[model samples]
Target: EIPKEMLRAQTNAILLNVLKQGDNYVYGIIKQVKEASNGEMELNEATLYTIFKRLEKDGIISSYWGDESQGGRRKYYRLTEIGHENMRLAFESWSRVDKIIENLEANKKSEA
Candidate 1:
């Protein structure tokens, strides 16, 4: 079973798409992450906010106010140089893992 909170930090730390989307753009990425991870890896709003704040505090990202149509104000998160490095590392790691998994699954299929 996936641990929600711990994985949440990892997801937040490496979600480059989230950085690309810019301020107040949590809709699609959050949905995708939640769906891919199911309830186990799903992070609560508070947890996400906490993670973002931590990243920002570390200079990994910067936040700015955005025009809010629905809420009072939308805070946008922008990735910094360090954040980009983290994303690249995370992406490479996942790519390696996905390649291994793909090979394993293909091998299993061939056996059957």
Candidate 2:
């Protein structure tokens, strides 16, 4: 199993990716992460909201109350323009790191 600590480090980027797909409420975000990771990942409300607080403060995301007719009004989150730009940069950074790691593994295999 992957360490929660490592997953926590990637939460910001992961959340940004999710919002890139569409606006979502807290529960919906949680459900989507679980589904996307095939049940390998689960985020509790406290941890999720902690990241939300940071992102909202940084202006990377915005939130609004959704329609109450759906039962209870939900606070939905969406990425701002800055958020989209940041997400793109984050993906690029991750891609570079991925390639570096792949190269290191290949070197190790050759040494062995």
Candidate 3:
């Protein structure tokens, strides 16, 4: 429904959606994002980490280190209260934009 660059810019929304599912490490979050978009979105590891860094600094999320005694250590991320608040607004904005797009498509489809 949208291009990669446009979809990629919705980092917060994507993160919120993924986090809403449960706590996740970077790999899990990336996998959820890919699945959610039906493989339309592919985010690089470095880029994802960069966004996670900003999200933490901005008070939208928190992270922690998991046990390293097993296979390896993993850092997990969870949404803060502020993050949930922000997600509400983000989803509202997304809904409006999506409705507009739907209307435009509906208008165009009738003739073709």
Candidate 4:
């Protein structure tokens, strides 16, 4: 399992992309994250909850109760309009890092 420190660095990006696919409850979010990362990453429950709380508190996400007749109630989260806008901006932030990495890789290839 990856450490919390490593996960912290990529948490926002991961959650944003996972939520982009569709709204989901905690378990569902965990499932998708595992799938998305090819099982290289798994979210610790408390950590996941923490991220959810921050996002919802910041207006980046909204949550609702899911209707499941035979099981426990599920709390689902969906991205809000503000979330979408923030994600757009987040991508720009990510792109800057990506560009920097790409440049470094190019320099390495040229030297090799």
Query: How much lDDT does each candidate structure score?
Result: 0.71, 0.88, 0.83, 0.85
Residue range 1-112, candidate 3, lDDT tens digits: 7886776577656777788778999888888788877998876888788778888998989988897878788899999999988888877998999999999999999979
Task: Assess candidate 4 and give its TM-score to the true structure.
Answer: 0.72
Q: Considering only N, C-alpha and C atoms within 3 Å, which residue pairs clash in candidate 1?
A: 23-76
Per-candidate TM vs. native? 0.53, 0.73, 0.67, 0.72
Backbone clashes, each candidate: 1, 0, 0, 0
Q: For residues 1-112, could you state the per-residue lDDT of candidate 1 as single tens digits?
A: 6897768756675465567555444554577677767745554666666777788788878877777766777666778888778778878999999999999999999999
Query: Candidate 2 at residue 102, lDDT?
Result: 100
Candidate number with greatest lDDT: 2
Clashing pairs in 2: none
C-alpha lDDT (0 to 100) for residue 70 of candidate 2: 72
The residue ranges of model 1 lying beyond 4 angstroms of the native Cα positions read 4-6, 13-15, 21-43, 68-72, 92-112
- Clash pairs (backbone) in predicted model 4: none
